[PDB]
């Protein structure tokens, strides 16, 4: 809902929030791993789920085709670890906009869930 949220923010702008423990291994730029991304909005509503295809997102870290927020999240999460990361416009979409209800200062959060490396 509209208002605030208990999420820790970084100096870059992106935020993070523990959702589920893991105790595996933090991904590293250059290595390929499989993770799950859940498109979440500021209100909390989801507008994108990997479930559509039913399969873990496997790709190479620090050398793929994602936004800063994504790389920053994938280069931090650990195998078996699940946590939500707030990806701002300055590190994702930007002030370019992507819709009427999507302002140039709008922020989007995505849930990262490491499956394996
Ligand atoms: C730079 C993107 O980075 C990636 O390469 C991976 N990525 C996308 O391609 C778009 C995703 C979100 C989309 O589903 C929305 C859907 C509506 C809101 C229209 C808008 C233009 C979109 O595209 C977020 C994402 O992480």
XYZ file of C-alpha atoms and ligand atoms in Angstrom:
143
model
C 0.000 0.000 0.000
C 0.863 3.716 -0.204
C 3.215 5.082 2.438
C 6.559 3.885 3.780
C 8.327 0.536 4.135
C 10.890 -1.162 6.375
C 13.653 -1.548 3.789
C 17.347 -0.699 4.090
C 18.748 1.566 1.376
C 22.327 1.894 0.133
C 24.464 4.845 -0.955
C 23.781 3.914 -4.581
C 20.015 4.039 -4.158
C 18.954 0.399 -4.368
C 17.448 -1.203 -1.266
C 17.397 -4.724 0.172
C 15.256 -6.799 2.535
C 15.831 -10.341 3.795
C 12.991 -12.685 2.840
C 14.463 -16.153 3.362
C 17.769 -17.482 4.690
C 20.109 -19.411 2.413
C 23.647 -19.973 3.671
C 24.996 -20.982 0.274
C 27.420 -18.970 -1.845
C 27.364 -15.347 -3.000
C 27.383 -15.016 -6.789
C 30.441 -13.546 -8.507
C 30.761 -11.395 -11.628
C 31.838 -13.647 -14.482
C 30.250 -16.872 -13.263
C 26.949 -18.289 -14.512
C 24.150 -18.992 -12.035
C 20.388 -19.517 -11.845
C 18.162 -17.076 -9.961
C 14.490 -16.103 -9.773
C 13.244 -12.543 -10.269
C 9.825 -11.327 -9.128
C 8.681 -8.019 -10.582
C 7.257 -6.107 -7.627
C 5.911 -2.559 -7.370
C 6.280 0.112 -4.685
C 2.827 -0.822 -3.393
C 3.903 -4.455 -3.256
C 1.802 -5.667 -6.176
C 3.538 -8.046 -8.582
C 3.503 -7.358 -12.323
C 5.992 -10.006 -13.447
C 6.800 -13.572 -12.401
C 9.232 -16.130 -13.819
C 6.516 -18.701 -13.126
C 5.143 -17.760 -16.547
C 7.819 -20.021 -18.026
C 8.336 -22.210 -14.958
C 12.138 -22.210 -14.828
C 15.068 -20.525 -13.032
C 16.745 -17.579 -14.755
C 20.213 -18.856 -15.658
C 22.763 -16.368 -16.990
C 26.281 -14.981 -16.578
C 26.861 -12.416 -13.830
C 28.616 -9.141 -14.588
C 28.178 -9.635 -18.314
C 24.609 -10.275 -19.399
C 21.687 -8.037 -20.328
C 20.104 -6.538 -17.211
C 19.887 -3.230 -15.348
C 22.272 -1.946 -12.678
C 19.832 -2.957 -9.957
C 19.797 -6.491 -11.342
C 23.575 -6.872 -11.567
C 23.957 -5.366 -8.095
C 21.440 -7.838 -6.703
C 22.746 -10.875 -8.570
C 26.278 -9.963 -7.495
C 25.267 -10.106 -3.843
C 22.645 -12.796 -3.296
C 23.769 -16.271 -2.232
C 22.691 -19.719 -3.428
C 19.472 -20.656 -1.660
C 19.064 -17.103 -0.420
C 15.925 -15.058 -1.034
C 15.634 -11.298 -0.543
C 13.809 -8.347 -2.103
C 15.891 -5.595 -3.707
C 14.455 -2.171 -4.534
C 15.628 -1.124 -7.996
C 15.228 2.655 -8.441
C 14.974 4.495 -11.786
C 18.458 5.984 -11.460
C 19.701 2.388 -11.489
C 17.084 0.856 -13.765
C 14.463 2.482 -15.978
C 15.357 6.124 -15.418
C 13.621 9.441 -16.042
C 12.755 8.251 -19.548
C 9.513 6.767 -18.253
C 7.658 3.687 -19.471
C 3.993 4.577 -19.074
C 1.445 7.064 -17.791
C 1.361 5.707 -14.246
C 5.127 5.243 -14.472
C 6.791 8.600 -13.694
C 10.471 9.436 -14.332
C 11.070 9.125 -10.589
C 9.134 5.879 -10.162
C 10.869 2.963 -8.444
C 10.488 -0.778 -9.015
C 11.398 -3.600 -6.633
C 12.330 -7.137 -7.672
C 12.547 -10.267 -5.520
C 15.780 -12.192 -6.075
C 15.909 -15.890 -5.196
C 19.167 -17.764 -5.782
C 18.618 -21.395 -6.774
C 22.135 -22.577 -7.614
C 25.442 -21.665 -9.256
C 16.094 -2.727 -18.938
C 15.261 -3.961 -18.557
O 16.163 -4.970 -18.048
C 16.140 -6.211 -18.581
O 16.819 -6.560 -19.528
C 15.175 -7.130 -17.861
N 13.867 -6.487 -17.571
C 13.064 -6.139 -18.625
O 13.389 -6.368 -19.773
C 11.740 -5.439 -18.370
C 11.135 -5.848 -17.020
C 9.737 -5.210 -16.741
C 8.584 -5.274 -17.791
O 7.740 -6.409 -17.561
C 7.759 -3.960 -18.036
C 6.251 -4.200 -18.350
C 5.461 -2.889 -18.583
C 5.279 -2.072 -17.281
C 6.125 -2.056 -19.705
C 7.633 -1.810 -19.451
C 8.247 -1.044 -20.646
C 8.340 -3.136 -19.189
O 9.212 -3.555 -19.927
C 12.188 -5.639 -15.921
C 13.510 -6.299 -16.261
O 14.246 -6.621 -15.349
